[PDB]
Amino acid sequence: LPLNAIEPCVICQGRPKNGCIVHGKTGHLMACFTCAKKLKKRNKPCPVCRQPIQMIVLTYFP
Amino acid sequence: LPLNAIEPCVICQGRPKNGCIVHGKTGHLMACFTCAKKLKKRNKPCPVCRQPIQMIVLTYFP
Amino acid sequence: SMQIFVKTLTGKTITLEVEPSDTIENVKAKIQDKEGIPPDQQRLIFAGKQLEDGRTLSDYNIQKESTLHLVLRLRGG
Amino acid sequence: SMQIFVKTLTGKTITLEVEPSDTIENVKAKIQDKEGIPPDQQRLIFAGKQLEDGRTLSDYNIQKESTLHLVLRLRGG
Amino acid sequence: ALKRIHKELNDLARDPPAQCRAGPVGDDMFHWQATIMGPNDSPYQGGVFFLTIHFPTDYPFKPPKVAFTTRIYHPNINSNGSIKLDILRSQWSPALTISKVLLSICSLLCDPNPDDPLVPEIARIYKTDREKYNRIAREWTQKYAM
Amino acid sequence: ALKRIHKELNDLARDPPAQCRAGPVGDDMFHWQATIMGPNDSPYQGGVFFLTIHFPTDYPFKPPKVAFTTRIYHPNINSNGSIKLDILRSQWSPALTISKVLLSICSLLCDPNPDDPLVPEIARIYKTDREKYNRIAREWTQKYAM
Ligand SMILES: [Cl-]
Ligand SMILES: [Cl-]
Ligand SMILES: [Cl-]
Ligand SMILES: [Cl-]
Ligand SMILES: [Zn+2]
Ligand SMILES: [Zn+2]
Ligand SMILES: [Zn+2]
Ligand SMILES: [Zn+2]
Numbered sequence A, B: 001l002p003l004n005a006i007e008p009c010v011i012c013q014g015r016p017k018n019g020c021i022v023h024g025k026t027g028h029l030m031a032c033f034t035c036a037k038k039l040k041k042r043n044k045p046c047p048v049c050r051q052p053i054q055m056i057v058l059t060y061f062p
Numbered sequence C, D: 001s002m003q004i005f006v007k008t009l010t011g012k013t014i015t016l017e018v019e020p021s022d023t024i025e026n027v028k029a030k031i032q033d034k035e036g037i038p039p040d041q042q043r044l045i046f047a048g049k050q051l052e053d054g055r056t057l058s059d060y061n062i063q064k065e066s067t068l069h070l071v072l073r074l075r076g077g
Numbered sequence E, F: 001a002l003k004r005i006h007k008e009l010n011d012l013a014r015d016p017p018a019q020c021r022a023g024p025v026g027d028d029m030f031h032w033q034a035t036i037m038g039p040n041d042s043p044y045q046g047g048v049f050f051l052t053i054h055f056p057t058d059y060p061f062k063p064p065k066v067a068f069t070t071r072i073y074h075p076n077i078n079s080n081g082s083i084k085l086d087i088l089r090s091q092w093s094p095a096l097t098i099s100k101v102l103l104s105i106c107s108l109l110c111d112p113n114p115d116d117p118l119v120p121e122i123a124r125i126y127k128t129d130r131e132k133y134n135r136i137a138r139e140w141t142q143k144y145a146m
Helices: A033-041 B033-041 C024-035 D024-035 E002-014 E098-109 E120-128 E130-144 F002-014 F098-109 F120-128 F130-144
Strands: A019-023 A026-031 A055-060 B019-023 B026-031 B055-060 C002-007 C013-018 C042-046 C067-072 D002-007 D013-018 D042-046 D067-072 E020-025 E028-037 E048-054 E065-068 F020-025 F028-037 F048-054 F065-068
Touching: A019 A033, A019 B055, A026 A033, A033 A055, A055 B019, B019 B033, B026 B033, B033 B055, C002 C024, C013 C024, C024 C042, C042 E098, C067 E098, D002 D024, D013 D024, D024 D042, D042 F098, D067 F098, E002 E020, E002 E028, E002 E098, E020 E098, E028 E098, E048 E098, E065 E098, E120 E130, F002 F020, F002 F028, F002 F098, F020 F098, F028 F098, F048 F098, F120 F130
Parallel strands: A026 B055, A055 B026, C002 C067, D002 D067
Antiparallel strands: A019 A026, A019 A055, B019 B026, B019 B055, C002 C013, C042 C067, D002 D013, D042 D067, E020 E028, E028 E048, E048 E065, F020 F028, F028 F048, F048 F065
């Protein structure tokens, strides 16, 4: 169980981790939607694995 | 912050929630990868919103 | 303005800021914003009965601190 | 067999089950399984130095309960 | 299925809805009993309706089998208590729990579908003489559910 | 940037790394001083190397500006303290924190790139006679980093 999943966005530290950075069949979820979308708009790689960002998924936890 | 994000998969209750069900630009993360892939393989919709499953993203929490 | 609670499909409970004049449709829009569930898939239940989109919380005598129960859209047949 | 810790890029600490004879390449493969980081993007550091893929944990005197530090692949220039 | 069923049971034992209750029959985790209180201000008010639940091997990918054991007058519930309801068949979701299924069924009691019914005779009364429908449903509630 | 910078500082105070330390100069949260301990089993051993850190207003989307203030002998760090290192330029990542940047720099000390050097003269010595390079690096550590 990912104990750090409930901590704030590692980039801005002010919003929940709801911006999943998707590349291929995997995703790294450590930033909020706002910060992740900025990286995608600027064509930046994934911050943790450097793979190209294919899309940002606004992630909900039902 | 999503406090329920650290609870086990709602389907099998035995694995962490690392199978993001993606539809359009949003995702519902409440099942593990194994359970979510079964739903995708069986052509089932998202369990919480019923929209078609475009892909399952194996989600990591850096 | 008052708060109500919604027990979502998995059992997770959320809090909404509402007014008694708010329609059920407005409430489902607020649930969509928090949960990403389209209103047409939301069925809200209170006192064992479904709540219809065109009516208000006041029409259903729903008061502050009430809990609404969210299930999936359904149809008998 | 023994446990070691890896402080990942965000500062999160993970635990790995390893053998002293495991190479750094084997350790990076285990990190890939847990974290989804390709081995070529992993730079492991211990005692202030990067760990080379072809060497073993024993070669580096990495013992039970040790902590390796993960940063991103880098290149001076 | 067992971890999921045990989780549901623990959640019910500590936090059921005011309207519905459920639990295993004896030691059979796959066979449960349930109760639904008839909604207030309805032909079912004051009634308590019993149901039987049978979880399949591949629950919750496959839906539970849910049937009333108490007789009940309703267009979408037949004389053996079978419930023709989409969430028990093609519109099932593995995120539905027994608690949510029971609340869903409870909400069906006052929201029947008389246009595509399970019991055409009851549906025809519902559509052409609603007070007669309500009167019979109240009679059945007194006779069977109290 | 302030929330992120404060979080990094609070983390550094709470779980302090051993090899590298850093914190604000005076009351300026955007201007820090750092130290790196020279790695054991290296010509830098026993040395303490000071660095300045400037955080840009749009940190961490843009990298921190990092320079040595202690003189150090290396192919990719010059006598004006400039560091030429890809993670401070095009290979920056917003997930790198100051502690990870400092540890990265520490690991560069014994993993130089003499092929694409900042100081060609030092890279030439490194490739001509590593023992001579190590001697000079040790002498500079004792002269400047103690
Ligand atoms: Cl996108
Ligand atoms: Cl898929
Ligand atoms: Cl099980
Ligand atoms: Cl800020
Ligand atoms: Zn953010
Ligand atoms: Zn990634
Ligand atoms: Zn599962
Ligand atoms: Zn969904």
